[PDB]
Design a protein around this ligand. Structure first.
Ligand SMILES: Nc1c2c(nc3ncnn13)CCC2
Length: 167
């Protein structure tokens, strides 16, 4: 049994809800919240920017030190950093950004990072300002992630379309 509430059921392991991931993280304090990161861990806009704002920029400070030591992530890669006031840990995952011309086949590699964690609160990778089709992102999620994932979808209209169209 876990703390996640109101999540709609998709498969054995994937659950979905219309929610603000910041507000959901603040309520649940999950072991892992996933950030929709870029390779530079520059959290200016999108989920990364909303999560970072909710940490009062502490996520960005920690991320800048990580990059100064380790260099950029790979597209499709991830790192585990603090969850600050939102979660125990934040898994920063880099999905391909279609608005930068990145290979969408890297989306499966991105979701494979989730399998290293038994339970996660996450957004749909490569959706929103990353430019991918969220229906496609949900399909790759369900077909890739084997661990228990609780997906938060910010837009109510999109949530309803994702549920209604789910095979
Ligand atoms: N959960 C959010 C928030 C914001 N912008 C977003 N863009 C995608 N998701 N997302 C600002 C308020 C919270």
């Amino acid at each position: 049994v876990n703390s996640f509430s109101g999540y709609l059921k998709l498969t054995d392991n994937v659950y979905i809800k219309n929610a603000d991931i910041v507000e959901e993280a603040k309520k649940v304090k999950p072991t892992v919240v996933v950030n929709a990161a870029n390779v530079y861990l520059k959290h200016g806009g999108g989920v990364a920017g909303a999560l970072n704002k909710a940490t009062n920029n502490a996520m960005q400070v920690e991320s800048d030190d990580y990059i100064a030591t380790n260099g950029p992530l790979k597209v499709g890669g991830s790192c585990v950093l603090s969850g600050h006031n939102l979660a125990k840990h934040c898994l920063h995952v880099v999905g391909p950004n279609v608005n930068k011309g990145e290979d969408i086949q890297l989306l499966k590699s991105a979701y494979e990072n989730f399998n290293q964690h038994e339970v996660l609160l996450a957004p749909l990778l490569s959706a929103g300002i990353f430019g991918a089709d969220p229906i496609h992102s949900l399909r790759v999620c369900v077909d890739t992630v084997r661990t228990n994932v609780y997906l938060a979808v910010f837009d109510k209209n999109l949530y309803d379309k994702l549920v209604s169209s789910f095979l």
